[PDB]
Every structure is written in C-alpha cells, then in structure tokens.
Symmetry: D2
Subunit: 62 residues, 4 copies
C-alpha cells in the first residue's frame, strides 16, 4: 500500500481530516492512495516530514 | 519576491544546496523563484514547514 | 465553473470517461472541478487542446 | 533520453522555444530533460499530442 495511506491510517485520520490537516487536496490524496498517480519529489519529501513529526507538522500549518 | 527565494536566501543556501537539502528538483525551484510557475498546495505547505524548522526538516530527510 | 467541467459536460462525458479518455487521474479531475486545486501550466495548455480537438486528441492517445 | 528531449530536438526547437510554444515552464522542461523529475500523467498525455501534431498543437495554443 502507498505510503500516504499507511501514514494516514497510522495517525487514525480519515481522508478528509488528513487532507485538511496537511493541506493535500482530497482528490489527489485519493489518487495517491488508490495508485492512480504518485506524489512528486517535493510531496514525497513532505510526506516523510509528516511521518517523522505529525503533530509538529500539523501545528506549523496552523 | 516568491516565498521560496526569501526562505532560501534567509538560510544562506544556493539554489543547488536548497534543491538537494529539501528534495525540490532544481528546475522547478528556479521556476518558482523566477515566477514562471507557482508551488501547488502540498508544496506550499512543505515550504511553510521548511521555514518553521529548516534544520529539523533537513535532518528528517537524511 | 472550472474550464475542465465545462469542457467535459460539453462533450457529454462522465468524470470516469473523461479521466480514462484523456489520461487525467480521476481524483485530480475532481479537485479541479470542485475548485480544490487548479491545473498547472502544461495541464491548462493540454485542456485547451482537448477543447479545440476532442476527437483528434482522444484518437492520438489510443 | 527523455521523450520530451527527443520530441524537442526532432522539431529543431531550443528549450526556450519549446517552452514558449507549448506552455511548459522552462525549469520543469529542463528537469524532465535532465532526469531530475518526470512528467505526471496529464503532461505525458500532452507530450504525446505534441508529438502526433506539433503544428496543430502549437496553433491551438495561439
């Protein structure tokens, strides 16, 4: 399974919640989770930061 | 000036250095800095995290 | 309304059909149609070609 | 070599010319040609249309 889907489920967030908390448009989140497309390089780097620090990342965006 | 260019200069990094440290392909970094295109939503969110924590972000990617 | 939604409805295609015919991942099509994100420069150019020649474009991709 | 670089050289266009004619930001064109990143799905579809009809495509954008 795609890394974003692993990370989101491990944080116990719905797609809607993860989309709003981390500023990833919901359709593209769904594309990534379904294998319809893949995150580009800055997005992969961003997903790694979310994984390392989900709370710090979420707080920085608020 | 574009936010990425502000952030990079404030960190005293060349385009090459910033590109490698933060996993943003060099041509697209240059496009953003020159106003030839603009970062999408996940990229803007990512740039905000870099700005809030440049060292933590860089370390997480290593 | 977003240009892609105009074009798709004018061609009488569902989101699924338009996505498969024109190789635009379905989630991002939905993001564009709902105003959750906007097509980047190559995508806007591509949408203009689809609009000018929907059949020629579709045939070229097959 | 990347498809975009093949297509551009076969059309005898410089990077600048190809960028302006086909509305692909110059830095990202350079990233694609150098293997620093790869075109997403709508961009690949678009490049195929350019390849099939370079003149029709260019004219449609004017």
């Amino acid at each position: 399974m795609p890394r974003i889907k692993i990370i989101r489920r491990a944080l116990k967030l719905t797609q809607e919640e993860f989309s709003a908390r981390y500023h990833i448009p919901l359709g593209t989140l769904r594309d990534w989770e379904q294998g319809r497309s893949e995150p580009d390089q800055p997005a992969r780097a961003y997903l790694k930061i979310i994984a390392v620090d989900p709370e710090g990342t979420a707080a920085a965006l608020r």
